Amino acid sequence: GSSGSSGNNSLVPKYHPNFWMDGKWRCCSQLEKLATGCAQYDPTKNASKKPLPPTPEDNRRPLW
Ligand SMILES: [Zn+2]
């Protein structure tokens, strides 16, 4: 028994820095009910840091 999984993203993780009114957003003013964030995330503006990515492996190989 357990729980906790992660998926993959397609487009930069945006957000709505404004509210939605008048059948349309205020920050982006989109025309979709599930309109995805418009403002792109912020690399600097944050309270966390991540190290550099690891290195890949060599040519494929069987599992025997
Ligand atoms: Zn927006």
From Swiss-Prot:
The record's note on its domains: The N-terminal PH domain allows ITK to be recruited to the plasma membrane by an activated PI3 kinase. This domain also contains a proline-rich region (PRR). The adjoining domain is a SH3 domain, which binds to PRR (from itself or from other proteins). Next, a SH2 domain is required for binding tyrosine-phosphorylated substrates. In the C-terminal region, the kinase domain is required for tyrosine phosphorylation.
Tissue: T-cell lines and natural killer cell lines.
Binding locations of Zn(2+): H16, C27, C28, C38
Protein name: Tyrosine-protein kinase ITK/TSK
Zinc finger (Btk-type): 8-44
Family: Belongs to the protein kinase superfamily. Tyr protein kinase family. TEC subfamily.
Localization of this protein: Cytoplasm; Nucleus
Post-translational modification note: Ubiquitinated.
Induction: Through a myriad of surface receptors including the TCR/CD3 signaling complex, coreceptors, or chemokine receptors.
Disease: Lymphoproliferative syndrome 1: A rare immunodeficiency characterized by extreme susceptibility to infection with Epstein-Barr virus (EBV). Inadequate immune response to EBV can have a fatal outcome. Clinical features include splenomegaly, lymphadenopathy, anemia, thrombocytopenia, pancytopenia, recurrent infections. There is an increased risk for lymphoma.
Function description: Tyrosine kinase that plays an essential role in regulation of the adaptive immune response. Regulates the development, function and differentiation of conventional T-cells and nonconventional NKT-cells. When antigen presenting cells (APC) activate T-cell receptor (TCR), a series of phosphorylation lead to the recruitment of ITK to the cell membrane, in the vicinity of the stimulated TCR receptor, where it is phosphorylated by LCK. Phosphorylation leads to ITK autophosphorylation and full activation.
Segments traversing the membrane: none
Subunit structure, as described in the record: Homooligomerizes; this association negatively regulates kinase activity. Interacts with PPIA/CYPA; this interaction regulates TCR signal strength via a proline-directed conformational switch in ITK. Interacts with THEMIS. Interacts with FASLG. Interacts with VAV1; this interaction is important for VAV1 localization and TCR-induced actin polarization. Interacts with TBX21.
